[PDB]
Amino acid sequence: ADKTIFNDHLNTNPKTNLRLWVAFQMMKGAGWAGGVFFGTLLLIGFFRVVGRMLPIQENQAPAPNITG
Amino acid sequence: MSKFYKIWMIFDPRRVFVAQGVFLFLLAVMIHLILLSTPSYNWLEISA
Amino acid sequence: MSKFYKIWMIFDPRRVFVAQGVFLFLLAVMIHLILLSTPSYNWLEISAAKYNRVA
Amino acid sequence: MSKFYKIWMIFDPRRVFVAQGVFLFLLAVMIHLILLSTPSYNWLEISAAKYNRVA
Amino acid sequence: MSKFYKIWMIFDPRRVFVAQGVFLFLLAVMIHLILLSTPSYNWLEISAAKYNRVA
Amino acid sequence: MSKFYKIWMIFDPRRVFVAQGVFLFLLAVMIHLILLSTPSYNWLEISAAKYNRV
Amino acid sequence: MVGVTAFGNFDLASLAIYSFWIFLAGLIYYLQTENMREGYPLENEDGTPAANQGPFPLPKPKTFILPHGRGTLTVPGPESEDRPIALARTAVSEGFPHAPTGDPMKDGVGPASWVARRDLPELDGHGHNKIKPMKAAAGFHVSAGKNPIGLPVRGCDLEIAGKVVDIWVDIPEQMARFLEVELKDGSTRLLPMQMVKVQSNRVHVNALSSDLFAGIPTIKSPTEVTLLEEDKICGYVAGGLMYAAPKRKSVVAAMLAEYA
Amino acid sequence: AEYQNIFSQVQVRGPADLGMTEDVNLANRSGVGPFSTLLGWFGNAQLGPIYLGSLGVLSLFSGLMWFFTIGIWFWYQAGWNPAVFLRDLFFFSLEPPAPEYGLSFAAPLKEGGLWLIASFFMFVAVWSWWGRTYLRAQALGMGKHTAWAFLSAIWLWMVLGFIRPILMGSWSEAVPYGIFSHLDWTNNFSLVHGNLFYNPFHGLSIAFLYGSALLFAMHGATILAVSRFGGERELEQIADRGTAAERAALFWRWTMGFNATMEGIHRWAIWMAVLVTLTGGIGILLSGTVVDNWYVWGQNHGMAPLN
Amino acid sequence: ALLSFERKYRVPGGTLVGGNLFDFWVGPFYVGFFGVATFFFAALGIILIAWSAVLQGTWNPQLISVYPPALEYGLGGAPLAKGGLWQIITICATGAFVSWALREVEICRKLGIGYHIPFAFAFAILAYLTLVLFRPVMMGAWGYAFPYGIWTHLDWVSNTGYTYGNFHYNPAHMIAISFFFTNALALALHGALVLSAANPEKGKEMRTPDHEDTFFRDLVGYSIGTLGIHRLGLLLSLSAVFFSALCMIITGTIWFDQWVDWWQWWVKLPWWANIPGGING
Amino acid sequence: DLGYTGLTDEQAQELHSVYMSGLWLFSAVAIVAHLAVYIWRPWF
Amino acid sequence: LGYTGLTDEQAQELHSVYMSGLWLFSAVAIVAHLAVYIWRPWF
Amino acid sequence: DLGYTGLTDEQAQELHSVYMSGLWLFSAVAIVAHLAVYIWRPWF
Amino acid sequence: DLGYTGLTDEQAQELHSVYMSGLWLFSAVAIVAHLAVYIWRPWF
Amino acid sequence: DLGYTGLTDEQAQELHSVYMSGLWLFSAVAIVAHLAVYIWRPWF
Ligand code: BCL
Ligand SMILES: COC(C)(C)C/C=C/C(C)=C/C=C/C(C)=C/C=C/C(C)=C/C=C/C=C(C)/C=C/C=C(\C)CC/C=C(\C)CCC=C(C)C
Ligand SMILES: COC(C)(C)C/C=C/C(C)=C/C=C/C(C)=C/C=C/C(C)=C/C=C/C=C(C)/C=C/C=C(\C)CC/C=C(\C)CCC=C(C)C
Ligand SMILES: COC(C)(C)C/C=C/C(C)=C/C=C/C(C)=C/C=C/C(C)=C/C=C/C=C(C)/C=C/C=C(\C)CC/C=C(\C)CCC=C(C)C
Ligand SMILES: COC(C)(C)C/C=C/C(C)=C/C=C/C(C)=C/C=C/C(C)=C/C=C/C=C(C)/C=C/C=C(\C)CC/C=C(\C)CCC=C(C)C
Ligand SMILES: COC(C)(C)C/C=C/C(C)=C/C=C/C(C)=C/C=C/C(C)=C/C=C\C=C(C)\C=C\C=C(/C)CC/C=C(\C)CCC=C(C)C
Numbered sequence A: 001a002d003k004t005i006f007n008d009h010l011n012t013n014p015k016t017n018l019r020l021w022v023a024f025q026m027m028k029g030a031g032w033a034g035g036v037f038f039g040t041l042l043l044i045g046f047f048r049v050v051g052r053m054l055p056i057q058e059n060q061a062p063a064p065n066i067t068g
Numbered sequence B: 001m002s003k004f005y006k007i008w009m010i011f012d013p014r015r016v017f018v019a020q021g022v023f024l025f026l027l028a029v030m031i032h033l034i035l036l037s038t039p040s041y042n043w044l045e046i047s048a
Numbered sequence C, D, E: 001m002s003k004f005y006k007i008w009m010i011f012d013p014r015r016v017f018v019a020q021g022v023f024l025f026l027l028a029v030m031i032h033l034i035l036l037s038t039p040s041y042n043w044l045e046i047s048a049a050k051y052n053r054v055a
Numbered sequence F: 001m002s003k004f005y006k007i008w009m010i011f012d013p014r015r016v017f018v019a020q021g022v023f024l025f026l027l028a029v030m031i032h033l034i035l036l037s038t039p040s041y042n043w044l045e046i047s048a049a050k051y052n053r054v
Numbered sequence G: 001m002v003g004v005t006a007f008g009n010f011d012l013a014s015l016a017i018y019s020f021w022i023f024l025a026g027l028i029y030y031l032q033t034e035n036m037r038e039g040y041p042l043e044n045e046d047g048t049p050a051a052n053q054g055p056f057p058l059p060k061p062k063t064f065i066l067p068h069g070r071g072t073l074t075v076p077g078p079e080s081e082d083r084p085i086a087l088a089r090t091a092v093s094e095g096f097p098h099a100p101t102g103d104p105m106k107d108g109v110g111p112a113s114w115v116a117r118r119d120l121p122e123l124d125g126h127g128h129n130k131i132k133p134m135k136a137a138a139g140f141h142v143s144a145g146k147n148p149i150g151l152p153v154r155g156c157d158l159e160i161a162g163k164v165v166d167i168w169v170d171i172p173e174q175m176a177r178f179l180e181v182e183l184k185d186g187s188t189r190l191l192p193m194q195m196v197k198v199q200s201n202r203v204h205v206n207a208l209s210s211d212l213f214a215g216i217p218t219i220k221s222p223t224e225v226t227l228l229e230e231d232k233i234c235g236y237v238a239g240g241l242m243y244a245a246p247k248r249k250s251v252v253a254a255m256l257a258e259y260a
Numbered sequence H: 001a002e003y004q005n006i007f008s009q010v011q012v013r014g015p016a017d018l019g020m021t022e023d024v025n026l027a028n029r030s031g032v033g034p035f036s037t038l039l040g041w042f043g044n045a046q047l048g049p050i051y052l053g054s055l056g057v058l059s060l061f062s063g064l065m066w067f068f069t070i071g072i073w074f075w076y077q078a079g080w081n082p083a084v085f086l087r088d089l090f091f092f093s094l095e096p097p098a099p100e101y102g103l104s105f106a107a108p109l110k111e112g113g114l115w116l117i118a119s120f121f122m123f124v125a126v127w128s129w130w131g132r133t134y135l136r137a138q139a140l141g142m143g144k145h146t147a148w149a150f151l152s153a154i155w156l157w158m159v160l161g162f163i164r165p166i167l168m169g170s171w172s173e174a175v176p177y178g179i180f181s182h183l184d185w186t187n188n189f190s191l192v193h194g195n196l197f198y199n200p201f202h203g204l205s206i207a208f209l210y211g212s213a214l215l216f217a218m219h220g221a222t223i224l225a226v227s228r229f230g231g232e233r234e235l236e237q238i239a240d241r242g243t244a245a246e247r248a249a250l251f252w253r254w255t256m257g258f259n260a261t262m263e264g265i266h267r268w269a270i271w272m273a274v275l276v277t278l279t280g281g282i283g284i285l286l287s288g289t290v291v292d293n294w295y296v297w298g299q300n301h302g303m304a305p306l307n
Numbered sequence I: 001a002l003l004s005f006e007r008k009y010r011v012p013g014g015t016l017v018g019g020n021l022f023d024f025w026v027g028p029f030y031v032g033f034f035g036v037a038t039f040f041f042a043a044l045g046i047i048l049i050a051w052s053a054v055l056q057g058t059w060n061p062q063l064i065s066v067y068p069p070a071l072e073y074g075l076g077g078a079p080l081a082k083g084g085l086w087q088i089i090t091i092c093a094t095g096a097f098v099s100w101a102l103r104e105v106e107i108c109r110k111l112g113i114g115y116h117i118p119f120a121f122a123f124a125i126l127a128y129l130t131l132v133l134f135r136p137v138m139m140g141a142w143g144y145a146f147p148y149g150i151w152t153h154l155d156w157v158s159n160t161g162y163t164y165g166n167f168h169y170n171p172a173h174m175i176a177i178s179f180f181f182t183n184a185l186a187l188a189l190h191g192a193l194v195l196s197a198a199n200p201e202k203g204k205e206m207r208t209p210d211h212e213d214t215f216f217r218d219l220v221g222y223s224i225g226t227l228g229i230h231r232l233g234l235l236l237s238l239s240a241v242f243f244s245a246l247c248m249i250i251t252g253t254i255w256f257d258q259w260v261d262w263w264q265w266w267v268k269l270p271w272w273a274n275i276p277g278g279i280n281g
Numbered sequence J, L, M, N: 001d002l003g004y005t006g007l008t009d010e011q012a013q014e015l016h017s018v019y020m021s022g023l024w025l026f027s028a029v030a031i032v033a034h035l036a037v038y039i040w041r042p043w044f
Numbered sequence K: 001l002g003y004t005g006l007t008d009e010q011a012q013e014l015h016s017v018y019m020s021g022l023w024l025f026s027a028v029a030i031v032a033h034l035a036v037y038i039w040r041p042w043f
């Protein structure tokens, strides 16, 4: 809430500020969704890396369920 | 489409924008994953 | 049909619009997945067969 | 039929409209899925066999 | 036989009526399913055999 | 035997009637099903054999 | 009786499974009717009985004979708030939040709500007061853990609001319930033990800011606390979680408010 | 982080609580045991006093004799070697009589008779403990709900050890005493009767065991969430509904559309736990006596793909 | 549509996402942003299970099964009719569960209660993700997850268990089973005790927590307390789920043989391995 | 007059009369159905 | 003794009605058993 | 005039008239769809 | 006359007109897409 | 005039103009990406 000292960004016309605010709201939502998705992808990648380290391919279980 | 603007007098703008950003990203991810599902368009299947 | 506007005298537009958006997106996703499941109308597989992409 | 309107003296229109919408959607989906399950009336497969898409 | 009405001095009429409705419906469904389960008295199979539906 | 009515001064008639009804129905169903299980007294199968339904 | 079927494939196992389905339906009905002994009949957002009451009917009333001559309680029975509710409808349509008219923590609405219970102390089996200050409890003393008596009390705004003077203990359970906290003005408030984090040097109360400690409802008797006073204190402290949020100095909250 | 109320952050200790004296014979009640600081971090620190009545004495003697009989058999199986006893503690087994003896009590002592002796001791111990629960409830004027829930558990136990072996006409059907041995009995029971998974009553028993875990998680979480309002004092909430009971009810009503009461949730709890052993006993009783292969039964009842 | 006391608790706030956009109730259900998400994911998953029933060719609910992709497909996508539907339903199920947990977080914030309930649900979500996501990813194929059928996921459990001999010998499995049994026992005891206190012998006064503690001390010589018993129930359930997830995450990843072969390590300790007699001698 | 339900004697009599009318109607329909089935396919 | 709380005359009237119902039920049962035994005896 | 829902008779009549208009429109669309399907592929 | 949402008849009419405008636009786009798909690959 | 959000008609018009400008820009970018993909690998 404290005033910025830069004051150069204030030269933009207020309609561009409104457009930036709308884009920022949409980008905040999309960035949170992307953070969730990339965290899930990193969890999957961590488990895949651990599985690669472990000797799964040397002795892996048969199919627990009939293929379908 | 002249009076569609009145939808912003029903739903709060910033909340709708945040939710719509989430929806757009999730839809994009869903379509990318469906494309990765098919053998064609599976661009991450670089093979020898 | 001229009195259908009275549906808004019964249902608040906010909840109805939320429900309708959810229902419409759900219905569209359902129909698209139904089409993708069948070998016909799976447009990705149709194009793959048309241009000889799948071995 | 003359005095059926009194059902709205007993049943709340909002509750009944929500229940009826859910019921109608679920019933229509159920009947469409029943038709799609049968090899006949599966209009996707019928069209595939008619125009020989599966080849 | 004449004093049987006094049962309503003992049993709440609403609870008895609900329980009796449920009991009668379950009993009728059970007997109908018994009849359908047996190869004889399955009126659907009997009708099929009578008019040679199975062909 | 003449003084059996005093049993209602020891037992709640409502609970006794409910328990009796449940017990009688369960017993009747059990006996009818036991008769159905045995090849004899399965009146459906007996009728089928008698009138050559099978 | 292996393979003995009364009809079709229906055998003793099928009989058992269908009879259990019937029994389970009856048991679910019974359990739901038992659960329908509080909060019913349903009401509209204005207070009048609702048209919809649910498929399950109300059970026949049952009477609890309360201990220590506290009377009886018949449920289901006529129950009302027995307190003004400082809420205003935010929409004519039902299913929408009701906004507080004034200060919700003072009004006792929302997460700061409280129930008009008996204005009497909770009693143990012997009839004595269940919750008593440790000074008035014979032989009670802190047995393990950090003793909170004497520690400063820090609010959610990282400002000290008083010091712990005494511990209120539950005599049968032998566990601490309330910390008595002396404020800057010399008066004492009560804090639920579940809302305070006893650290090595201070007692941290994340629910309330320092300036809100004065607003905590007080006990009319220094030695006993009634159920109504307990409910008011707990409601105030817990509602501080959602209503003292602006005063809370959480870093994650500050960063989120930077972009919101 | 905030205080989650999982562990007490401070312990207070006062005079030992001697308990109520509604109709309990105080002579049979022992003295208060030590206070455990470790137990105090989680629940009450006080140990005892315990009631040592006639049924308590009978149950303790019978259970001690059962345990001692199994232990002496294990020592015999170990060759009286303490090292072998410790090595093979989980592999020792007090097996029931072989099928050739049927239900007869003529099995030799080392070939089934000792199992019968131990089983008699366990039978007496368990039934005397059930009587003990009933009489402890009766002496305090409380309801007999604990007695009936224990009766459901005893029903499953009796089916496993007594009723089903009688209906099958062989003590060999009963469960051996021993850790891995009774695990192997469980596995072999499933294998012999054709994939006990397809027992519908075993499925119901699993449904109610999962429901017990789910419901105790939900209930413990709910009470710990509302304990800031004194929600742990549930009898008070039953007598005088505070804001804790209302907040719990409203949480579950807004989450899943329906709620319980502070008393009715415990009816849900007792029935969810009871049905575990009830359906389990029924399913075990049906196995072998009525259905010899549960997979074929499921095939004939539309639970399995073929047929 | 409201309980006799619900009115004073329906206030704005507590939402994580959306502000007042979805801050409303549909009947008794609180919707919120994550409630909208939960409903969408749940409806999509149910409709896709019905559609997979259509594709499979059976309408019997017990025979309906949505099998994961075969092991030939690895961790990649699969055709919808042969494994892709399972992947979509798994994504929908994970989304529905996480949205349900976050909706519970929103409801907790609105009511001012602790977050024990969504935190406890997170354990069940983690066990589910272990069975469908973490373990199949570690093993490198979606075909190691279970099918979405009433009786076919039992076939998955049976086959996975008998892959490693008798699965009873998994030690983490033993701990999880003991926790489950103890939790059921404690739940029975707690429900029975509270009911006995609140419903005493006919005509007698309602009992107090002192009576409950007296009963359990006279029974087993110890009473854990009301707060103690609720803590114990939560911890027993959570520990059971945690140890079951651990048992499945170590099975097929760091252990591959029969589990009784695991138990052989105690037998073969140097100081008593060679001693004759007993069972393993 | 135990009065477990609060119904008076006259109320109980009227309720039982209506209930017996319904029961006799149901029983008459059941008897007709049984006669039709026995004519169509006797089970004795 | 008076466990139920019923007056003696109330108990006697209730017993009379209950015995009428029991006799009707048992008479119908006897007719059914006689019909079954004529149709198919079990001895 | 039971008035469980609080609607008056006139309100109920107007609501029912509009509801039946909607129901008859829905039924007419369904009838047209059934005629189209029966022409395209009869099920009788 | 009936009041459940606080909207007047004029407000309800305006809301419904805008909603119908949106519905008809959505239906027009759907019809165009259906024509495109039917031309590309008919299903009848 | 409903004003569920406190926005006036002019505020709603201005915000919707901004939003529609952004929507058309995003749609144009998506159309460019779709043209690129369709040239690279058509799906029809
Ligand atoms: C290969 C193994 C088989 C199989 C074979 C069996 C068999 C066989 C049985 C079960 C049974 C059960 N199985 Mg199974 N089960 C399998 C797979 C599973 C799976 C799974 C995820 O795969 C699960 C969750 C379950 C779950 C269950 C439970 C629902 C149920 C036991 C209830 C219980 O608490 O019993 C344990 C509780 C008791 C035995 C009651 C004990 C009560 C007595 C009074 C206690 C006395 C204590 C004594 C005196 C000691 C005192 C100590 C002192 C106090 C210190 N099974 C597979 C298919 N399962 C049982 C059942 O009911 O099935 C229908 C059963 O008999
Ligand atoms: C496995 O076993 C098999 C199935 C093979 C064989 C079966 C065996 C068994 C056990 C069969 C059991 C049969 C039984 C017990 C049948 C019982 C039937 C009865 C008693 C039926 C009763 C029907 C009554 C009806 C339909 C009454 C309806 C009444 C009304 C609709 C009117 C009620 C209105 C009233 C009272 C108005 C209120 C009054 C006032 C004054 C305000
Ligand atoms: C498995 O079984 C199969 C599927 C094979 C066969 C199926 C069998 C069965 C059981 C089928 C079931 C059929 C049934 C029961 C169908 C029922 C259909 C009904 C009743 C449909 C009703 C439709 C009504 C509609 C669409 C009404 C719409 C109304 C409006 C759009 C206007 C609403 C506005 C109002 C009332 C304004 C309010 C007025 C004022 C003044 C405020
Ligand atoms: C398995 O079965 C399958 C799926 C194969 C077959 C499917 C069967 C079924 C069940 C199909 C279902 C069909 C149905 C029921 C479709 C329903 C379609 C409808 C009703 C669509 C409605 C669309 C309406 C739209 C897009 C309206 C949009 C409106 C706007 C963008 C403007 C909103 C703004 C307003 C009103 C401002 C008002 C504010 C003020 C202040 C006046
Ligand atoms: C299974 O089904 C599959 C996935 C196969 C197929 C999927 C089907 C379905 C159902 C798809 C769903 C599609 C829908 C409903 C899409 C909806 C899209 C919409 C409405 C998108 C709206 C986007 C609006 C945006 C991005 C607005 C942004 C506004 C701003 C950023 C503010 C204005 C700022 C500007 C113009 C910046 C200007 C800067 C310069 C340099 C000119
Ligand atoms: C080292 O220190 C010493 C030796 C002093 C003490 C050590 C003791 C040890 C090592 C004890 C070990 C105990 C163990 C491992 C016990 C395991 C028990 C298990 C796992 C039991 C599992 C199931 C048991 C069941 C289901 C039992 C059912 C029994 C009944 C239902 C009773 C049956 C009753 C019968 C047959 C009565 C027959 C007799 C007459 C007179 C009619």
Ligand SMILES: [Fe+2]
Pocket: H219, H223, H234, H266, I190, I194, I230
């Ligand atoms: Fe509890």
